[PDB]
Amino acid sequence: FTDYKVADITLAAWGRRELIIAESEMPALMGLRRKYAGQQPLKGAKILGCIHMTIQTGVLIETLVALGAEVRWSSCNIFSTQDQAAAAIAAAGIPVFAWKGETEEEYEWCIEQTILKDGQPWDANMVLDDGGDLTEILHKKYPQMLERIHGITEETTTGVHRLLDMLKNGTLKVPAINVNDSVTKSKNDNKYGCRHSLNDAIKRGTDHLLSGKQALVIGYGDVGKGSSQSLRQEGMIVKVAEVDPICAMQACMDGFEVVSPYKNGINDGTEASIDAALLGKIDLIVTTTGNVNVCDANMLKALKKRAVVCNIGHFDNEIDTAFMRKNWAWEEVKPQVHKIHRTGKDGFDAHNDDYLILLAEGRLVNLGNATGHPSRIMDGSFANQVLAQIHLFEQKYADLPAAEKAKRLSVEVLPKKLDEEVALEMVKGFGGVVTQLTPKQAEYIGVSVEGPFKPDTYRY
Amino acid sequence: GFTDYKVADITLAAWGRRELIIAESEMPALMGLRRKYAGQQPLKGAKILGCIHMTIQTGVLIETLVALGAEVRWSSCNIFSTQDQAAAAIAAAGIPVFAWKGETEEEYEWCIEQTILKDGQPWDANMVLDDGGDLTEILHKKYPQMLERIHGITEETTTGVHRLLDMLKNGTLKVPAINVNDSVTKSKNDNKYGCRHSLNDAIKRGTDHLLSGKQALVIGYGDVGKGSSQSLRQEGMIVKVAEVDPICAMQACMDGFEVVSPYKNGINDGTEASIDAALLGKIDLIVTTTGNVNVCDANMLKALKKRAVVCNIGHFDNEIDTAFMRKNWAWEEVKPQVHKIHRTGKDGFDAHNDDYLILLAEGRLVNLGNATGHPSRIMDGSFANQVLAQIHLFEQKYADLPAAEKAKRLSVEVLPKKLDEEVALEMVKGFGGVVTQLTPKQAEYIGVSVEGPFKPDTYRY
Amino acid sequence: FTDYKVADITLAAWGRRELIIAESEMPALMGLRRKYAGQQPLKGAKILGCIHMTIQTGVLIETLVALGAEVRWSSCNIFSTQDQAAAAIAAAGIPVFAWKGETEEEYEWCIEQTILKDGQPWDANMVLDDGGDLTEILHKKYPQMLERIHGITEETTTGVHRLLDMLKNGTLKVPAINVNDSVTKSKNDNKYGCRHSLNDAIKRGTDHLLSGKQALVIGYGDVGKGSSQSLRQEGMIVKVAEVDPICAMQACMDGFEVVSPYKNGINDGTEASIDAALLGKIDLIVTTTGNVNVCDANMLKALKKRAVVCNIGHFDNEIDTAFMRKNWAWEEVKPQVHKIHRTGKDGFDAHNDDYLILLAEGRLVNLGNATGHPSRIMDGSFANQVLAQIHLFEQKYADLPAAEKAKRLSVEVLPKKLDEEVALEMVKGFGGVVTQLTPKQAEYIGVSVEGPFKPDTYRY
Amino acid sequence: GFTDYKVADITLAAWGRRELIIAESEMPALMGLRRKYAGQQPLKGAKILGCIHMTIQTGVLIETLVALGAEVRWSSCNIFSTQDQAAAAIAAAGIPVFAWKGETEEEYEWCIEQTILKDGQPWDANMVLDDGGDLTEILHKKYPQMLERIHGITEETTTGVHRLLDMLKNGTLKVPAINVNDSVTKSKNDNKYGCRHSLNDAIKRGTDHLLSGKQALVIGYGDVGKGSSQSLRQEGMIVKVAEVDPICAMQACMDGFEVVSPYKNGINDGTEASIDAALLGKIDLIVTTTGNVNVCDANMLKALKKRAVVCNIGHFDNEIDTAFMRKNWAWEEVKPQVHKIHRTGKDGFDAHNDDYLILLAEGRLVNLGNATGHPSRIMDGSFANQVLAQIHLFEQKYADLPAAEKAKRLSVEVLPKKLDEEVALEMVKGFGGVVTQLTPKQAEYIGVSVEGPFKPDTYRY
Ligand SMILES: NC(=O)c1ccc[n+]([C@@H]2O[C@H](COP(=O)([O-])OP(=O)(O)OC[C@H]3O[C@@H](n4cnc5c(N)ncnc54)[C@H](O)[C@@H]3O)[C@@H](O)[C@H]2O)c1
Ligand SMILES: NC(=O)c1ccc[n+]([C@@H]2O[C@H](COP(=O)([O-])OP(=O)(O)OC[C@H]3O[C@@H](n4cnc5c(N)ncnc54)[C@H](O)[C@@H]3O)[C@@H](O)[C@H]2O)c1
Ligand SMILES: NC(=O)c1ccc[n+]([C@@H]2O[C@H](COP(=O)([O-])OP(=O)(O)OC[C@H]3O[C@@H](n4cnc5c(N)ncnc54)[C@H](O)[C@@H]3O)[C@@H](O)[C@H]2O)c1
Ligand SMILES: NC(=O)c1ccc[n+]([C@@H]2O[C@H](COP(=O)([O-])OP(=O)(O)OC[C@H]3O[C@@H](n4cnc5c(N)ncnc54)[C@H](O)[C@@H]3O)[C@@H](O)[C@H]2O)c1
Ligand SMILES: Nc1ncnc2c1ncn2[C@@H]1O[C@H](CO)[C@@H](O)[C@H]1O
Ligand SMILES: [Cl-]
Ligand SMILES: [K+]
Ligand SMILES: [K+]
Numbered sequence A, C: 001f002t003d004y005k006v007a008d009i010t011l012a013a014w015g016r017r018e019l020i021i022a023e024s025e026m027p028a029l030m031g032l033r034r035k036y037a038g039q040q041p042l043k044g045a046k047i048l049g050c051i052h053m054t055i056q057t058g059v060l061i062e063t064l065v066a067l068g069a070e071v072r073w074s075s076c077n078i079f080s081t082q083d084q085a086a087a088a089i090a091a092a093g094i095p096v097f098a099w100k101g102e103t104e105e106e107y108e109w110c111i112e113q114t115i116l117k118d119g120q121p122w123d124a125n126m127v128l129d130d131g132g133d134l135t136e137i138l139h140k141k142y143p144q145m146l147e148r149i150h151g152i153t154e155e156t157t158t159g160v161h162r163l164l165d166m167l168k169n170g171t172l173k174v175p176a177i178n179v180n181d182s183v184t185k186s187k188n189d190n191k192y193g194c195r196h197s198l199n200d201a202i203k204r205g206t207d208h209l210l211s212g213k214q215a216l217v218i219g220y221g222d223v224g225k226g227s228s229q230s231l232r233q234e235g236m237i238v239k240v241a242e243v244d245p246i247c248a249m250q251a252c253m254d255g256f257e258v259v260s261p262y263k264n265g266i267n268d269g270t271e272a273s274i275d276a277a278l279l280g281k282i283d284l285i286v287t288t289t290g291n292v293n294v295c296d297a298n299m300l301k302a303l304k305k306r307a308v309v310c311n312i313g314h315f316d317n318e319i320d321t322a323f324m325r326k327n328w329a330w331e332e333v334k335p336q337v338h339k340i341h342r343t344g345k346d347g348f349d350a351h352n353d354d355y356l357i358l359l360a361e362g363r364l365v366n367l368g369n370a371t372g373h374p375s376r377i378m379d380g381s382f383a384n385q386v387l388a389q390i391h392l393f394e395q396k397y398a399d400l401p402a403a404e405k406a407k408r409l410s411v412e413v414l415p416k417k418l419d420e421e422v423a424l425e426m427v428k429g430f431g432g433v434v435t436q437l438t439p440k441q442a443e444y445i446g447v448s449v450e451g452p453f454k455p456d457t458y459r460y
Numbered sequence B, D: 001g002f003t004d005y006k007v008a009d010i011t012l013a014a015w016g017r018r019e020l021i022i023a024e025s026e027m028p029a030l031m032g033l034r035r036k037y038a039g040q041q042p043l044k045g046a047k048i049l050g051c052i053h054m055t056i057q058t059g060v061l062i063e064t065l066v067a068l069g070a071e072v073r074w075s076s077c078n079i080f081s082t083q084d085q086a087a088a089a090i091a092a093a094g095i096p097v098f099a100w101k102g103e104t105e106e107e108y109e110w111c112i113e114q115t116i117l118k119d120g121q122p123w124d125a126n127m128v129l130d131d132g133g134d135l136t137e138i139l140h141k142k143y144p145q146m147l148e149r150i151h152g153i154t155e156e157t158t159t160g161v162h163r164l165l166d167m168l169k170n171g172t173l174k175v176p177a178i179n180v181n182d183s184v185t186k187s188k189n190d191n192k193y194g195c196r197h198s199l200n201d202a203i204k205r206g207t208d209h210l211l212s213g214k215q216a217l218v219i220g221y222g223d224v225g226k227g228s229s230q231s232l233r234q235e236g237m238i239v240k241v242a243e244v245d246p247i248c249a250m251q252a253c254m255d256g257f258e259v260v261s262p263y264k265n266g267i268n269d270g271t272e273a274s275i276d277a278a279l280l281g282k283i284d285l286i287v288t289t290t291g292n293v294n295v296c297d298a299n300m301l302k303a304l305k306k307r308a309v310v311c312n313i314g315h316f317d318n319e320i321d322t323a324f325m326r327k328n329w330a331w332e333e334v335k336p337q338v339h340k341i342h343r344t345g346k347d348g349f350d351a352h353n354d355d356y357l358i359l360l361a362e363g364r365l366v367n368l369g370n371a372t373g374h375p376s377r378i379m380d381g382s383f384a385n386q387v388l389a390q391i392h393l394f395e396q397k398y399a400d401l402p403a404a405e406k407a408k409r410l411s412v413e414v415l416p417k418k419l420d421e422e423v424a425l426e427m428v429k430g431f432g433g434v435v436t437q438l439t440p441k442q443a444e445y446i447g448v449s450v451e452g453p454f455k456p457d458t459y460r461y
């Protein structure tokens, strides 16, 4: 087997050992593997996959293959691959093009190696995406391949936004399942995953004590909520910035002071609008928004000396790293850990005190400086992915008449019943015991003993 | 010359008025609506039948509605939740209120009827504000002619919303309703953080028991169960959680709780054999939060650790099988809303018996029964939604619509997200919080207006 | 029986019901009652007791009586008595003079009614004190009564400091046991007691939401640590002030921002030294120091409008309430809750917004606005009190030759072995199971299987 | 041409120097001593044998000693605790250091001997800095003539202090010592908050296991056990605590933990039958924190839940009976310092066997073995104490005292509280904290100087 490209194939044995452990940590995913094995519901599926090539993604890949699928894989981020994971996958005869520390050029080349097989477009018919880069390349650069593709299953908030834009503009060519908005994804992965992995990544990069220091978390969505808890539970004094007053209300009630980097919250683009007194006290800033330029150049100028800057949103443009490349000198401490010296561009004193520490060059810090979410959390997200792949593959959108296609061209979530069945396997993994409603109780609250237990409007 | 009320002690009005003035300073969203709408008088002509816990916080709600032009007739939705100084202050303001702490069930029904009738005949009501649905059902069953002229119902709580949706499904709901519970600044504020504040509050006032180091079992992990578990865990309790919803159970696990069932393998076959006696024999405190029926049953009550505390914070007392305890065991009142229930028999007890349980508020909602319910700054969000919902339905004038137009608007709906955000903004400012304004580039990048709404309707927060 | 003065004797039955419950919450105290009942170790003891007349003190009193002692009792604070507990004690034929809401003159009168029986000095031979007021009165006004007193058992930090002042000055006339510095007192009562009862008292007095609001705790000793946790666990944003750098270091590591009411921590006595910006954002200030004037007039002037002010140290002079009585207008909301209108002295407007809320008129707020520490915590403190009374009464200091007295005139703590045996009964009250060292393990760390398990230097 | 060292890879020096420069900015108390004492050179002539984890933080301590005038010869006190980039950077500065991560036991002993001997003969040492007491014991057993000229020992950790006090009461201690562990800015900072930071850190790096919602058992609740329990509980673990000390057990209860024993009724009867198999069958993670012997024994290891993680954060690996596991079960290395112990037999194993335990750092102290130990800003307190203790004993010059004067000073003592406070003040300033200054009236009221010390020596904090 040579249809791959990884950092070091000799890491495969190590990756396989960690894959075996991860399988024991992912009961929902492994449960699907045993349930659907004899049926082979993905036989004939040829899946283009683009998501962080971690140990956890390895278990997802092998679940899809075990259910009958062929795949070609790459990572959706230059720093998120675990090289032992990519090596174990390649060693198993699965095409994977991913390594930790890709250049942007290599990142694009890796996506192209999955799209093309032996010089020609692969006969792909399914897409699994995290962020939407692969989805967009197919629409812009390989639209004829989408004629053969039955659906897209998208993992993350940013990718869902990009799908809804295409649907709104009439440019989405195949239906999609919003995997992010399963409760066992968004309210598990996005929140608790970042709770586990944000302080993890900061410790590995800097080994900084967090207790007693000042943090500013930009955003209080699902990622912002879990990120704030990751820091608060270590004893940081956390302040939260938000543009959504409802999310700000939650931050207040959760015990956080709500502040803005700009005086009265108004960014007029001038340095005068920066709350310099506030930013001059911040030891750590974390962006979690999925928005653009939420930690801008004037904020970076005003930050306390030696503050840590990192981003756990999907794309690095949450921080204006371009400004820092243009104006300030970068000192690599170690991979994915740079000191940014604010004294000049073309040199720095080795003992300069006026620097910031930037983690993963602004790319998602939990995957860049650690290993991302733990297996038992990703088990939920990826059990949803497998169910979403099965759902859209069985629909065979590409084989339907143009009339029927119009009725099925949508961006939908999985039924709540499947959301609940994933959650049950997760609960059992903890040794939890769910109570069974009696017939009288089920009738009293108007549900079936089997579920679903909540109306679709329920927010949990 | 005003006598159109019944409260426990009108001499408590000055005290209640002092606490209302304090509460106003704790409720900026509600007092913001007062200042914003006072000149416009959007409720001029509204005549509101109100049934919700007659607390200091409800007093501020009542006076906001009146300040916006409404007349009201008020009762409590629970026999133990009234604060007598609040009821007295409202009555002293010239507002008909029929409520006191410690009503009997017969007095409870009488109070509701005193709001429905004025001088022995139906009041010219045209709006309903309800918490739980008792008033709503009485009107549908007994006063359908009054509903003809009523423009809407604004319902506060999860249980009431469920009852409204049953009526709408059956075709028996007579007037449209706003689901006030499912505003985010209600459900994810009141239901969760309010119980966080007030559950351990009520337990302390009733028993003064140390909570740290003891074992608790919370039945349910929806919004009330989430807030209740935190109220106990933050005090240092070792908290276990029961759930029938595996999604909510998954959240309990991730939040750091052990998820257990009172029944072996979670199967309640009705027999004492199915009870996990070893588990229940260790529990010092059980709290029901489900809005369901009989989730702390007779067999669980028999198996509970001696001297365990039993309480409910769901809306209705049938979450616990108190009827079994009245039939079989001897009740000794420690003090109002605190009873020792001696499992040694129905007739008499030894004053030094050790085989008893402690029941709070006779199974009624414990935060309002043994304390004062949610604090003003939390109820600010819920009651700002109530005022916006009254304005919304009153302006629509459903009762005046022709039959064909009524049919298109007979629904149970929530307020628009923009209003939810505007309530939240006033709450955030009340804490001194500063929200950031999106730049035009940022607003375009995430596809929202600089003014909001900032999230799609599918967003769960 | 008429040798008492309580607010309402008809509250006795209610207090008895709560005493029966408290007995079930105090296993260390009830274990001493049963272990020593037959031996009657306090036969002949006549104890002058001065400590908050709560339900928990009732169980302590009846324990002392059950072991053979006679007592004459009063409260050490004008607001700390629970009237149902006072009535239940009086109904049992025990002399007690205490009610909630005493004046200062009635307070001084109550202590005198324990000192004197039928107009003559009681023939007391033991003292139990909390704060040292009774101890000082006996030394200053009734020195001849101390000739027959065998010892003093002092409950709290402030009282112990006063005993140590008398000892170093040669004015102490009888030996004393420092009950406070048992670990099952100081590191249980002082810390976790205030954790339980500080937020309890604030809720009862004001029903204010605490989550999301700003607090300032003055002091970070045992009371300050417990108070800060009582607030932080409710979601308050808590800042801590301290003069001790070591205690301030613990506050930082515990996740609190450490601040001073004064610029650079320097109180020059002028309003210019007040950090007006800091204090203008504080919603709640709590004094925990046992020191004087730690919340002074200039701080009270700069506090945010409608801030809550309270003290949980032993004496009210931690707050300059005298300044507030002289210059501002007091409005009583209800007992132990006053609005202090900073608009001036001669009349307030009922709708004025510029006021502070003072709890318990500056007296210890947990006992003033709630019920103090819960029974299962006071179990530890009062088991120590009983052991201390037994210890000094057996020594019989008053009957010894002068050369032998000077040998035993000291302020002692109980031996660590008894400290541990108190803690064991507390642990068993929770259902906890300690492990028994094997002989090999005991030899390995140089202790007895029975304990003591730590050297006297150990700080826990 | 400097060759008097042995490290894993000297080309890691530049990386180590970059991390030392960062660490200096995180250690203000240590860098304050460097600035305060540089001109005075109070350790001029001092020759320090150092044996403590060769981390970045120890690097800053070493260079502070040298900056104050000392020469050192250094080794690590554990086979897995060295950071190779730190050792390289120290060796590149011309400082004799013998340490690498992953030493064998034989290489461990050799490294200590390379510090003791220079060019084959005893070095002219006159001070000792130790963590655990291995170096101290080797000198007493094997190099008594060197101790004649040594002025003192400054011992870092609880286990080492116990060994010093044993020798003192036996009359075998040859030079005085300072107990550095029992400074408050050490024991109640390093031992507690250091393990809070670094225990979950090491567990994540080794296994990447989710901790939230899983079951842990912490053996011990002293300073290390307290910090370790918080490390897991703050992550959402359901933590149970074992203790032999009822006072420490009381604190665990009040801190919100269930206190349990691995043995039924806490009594080891010498058989598997006294093991609480039901309890241990539910534990996902066990951590030993005691400084005792065999507190996680063979029968406990046999009863642990399948796939449980086993680690030790006390100083020595004999807290866990790893010898039993080596003799009876098959070890599969996952990666360095992470082994699956297959309980199916000693010979081999099926790669998909489910009946295994995961052992971290082979039972060696896990925060340093699987991560980097305590963070710089915590070690700042410990190592500022170490510098002050070295100064204090070196200035005393015990070795030069006549016999009758030595007898008056042969002791194991702590630093004065005033110095403990001055270390804390620098730590507090590092956070931006502002301590308040007592007024003269306030200082008089509580009977202290405005400069401190602020507490009596009896105070426990
Ligand atoms: N690294 C990870 O493991 C991980 C996991 C899940 C999601 N993500 C990514 O993280 C990002 C956030 O995801 P989410 O699910 O939390 O989305 P979300 O929509 O739930 O939350 C984003 C929040 O940012 C706020 N925000 C936007 N612009 C802001 C600004 N200028 N200032 C302050 N707040 C602002 C919004 O109000 C919103 O509440 C996405 O890009 C998503 O793909 C990363
Ligand atoms: N006292 C208060 O101040 C207050 C505040 C808000 C709501 N409430 C009341 O509390 C109740 C709960 O409200 P909510 O908003 O949390 O509703 P919810 O629907 O969000 O939560 C109820 C939960 O109970 C669970 N449940 C149902 N039957 C169960 C059983 N047999 N065992 C275990 N779990 C079971 C459900 O799965 C659900 O998650 C309602 O009656 C509501 O009106 C009271
Ligand atoms: N209300 C209760 O239930 C209760 C319980 C125990 C003790 N107490 C009382 O509380 C008080 C404190 O007791 P403790 O055991 O915590 O004593 P402590 O000595 O342990 O703590 C007092 C702290 O206050 C600090 N301090 C002193 N002056 C200060 C100032 N001006 N600014 C800031 N910090 C300052 C000291 O450094 C010290 O750390 C005593 O009066 C004690 O009797 C009350
Ligand atoms: N890894 C680190 O970074 C680090 C840091 C500081 C100390 N240490 C080491 O950790 C160990 C503990 O140090 P410490 O300061 O916490 O000591 P400590 O004396 O304060 O605590 C040890 C505790 O273990 C308890 N214990 C003893 N035998 C027990 C048994 N069989 N079962 C249950 N509990 C038992 C004791 O009662 C005691 O409370 C020492 O070996 C010390 O050198 C390691
Ligand atoms: N202090 C209070 N005043 C009025 N209503 C309250 C209070 N606390 C809780 N509630 C309401 O009571 C309902 C439960 O009956 C909840 O939906 C909640 O909104
Ligand atoms: Cl033995
Ligand atoms: K991972
Ligand atoms: K209230």
Ligand SMILES: [K+]
Residues within 6 Å of the ligand: B208, C054, C056, C371, C372, C373, C374, C375
């Ligand atoms: K009490």
Ligand SMILES: [K+]
Residues within 6 Å of the ligand: A207, D055, D057, D372, D373, D374, D375, D376
């Ligand atoms: K470190």
Ligand SMILES: [Zn+2]
Residues within 6 Å of the ligand: A050, A051, A052, A076, A077, A129, A130, A131, A132, A156, A314
């Ligand atoms: Zn992606």
Ligand SMILES: [Zn+2]
Residues within 6 Å of the ligand: B051, B052, B053, B077, B078, B130, B131, B132, B133, B157, B315
């Ligand atoms: Zn109601």
Ligand SMILES: [Zn+2]
Residues within 6 Å of the ligand: C050, C051, C052, C076, C077, C129, C130, C131, C132, C156, C314
């Ligand atoms: Zn007192």
Ligand SMILES: [Zn+2]
Residues within 6 Å of the ligand: C349, C350, C351, C352
């Ligand atoms: Zn007025």
Ligand SMILES: [Zn+2]
Residues within 6 Å of the ligand: D051, D052, D053, D077, D078, D130, D131, D132, D133, D157, D315
């Ligand atoms: Zn060591």
Ligand SMILES: [Zn+2]
Residues within 6 Å of the ligand: C445, C446, D162, D165
């Ligand atoms: Zn020892």
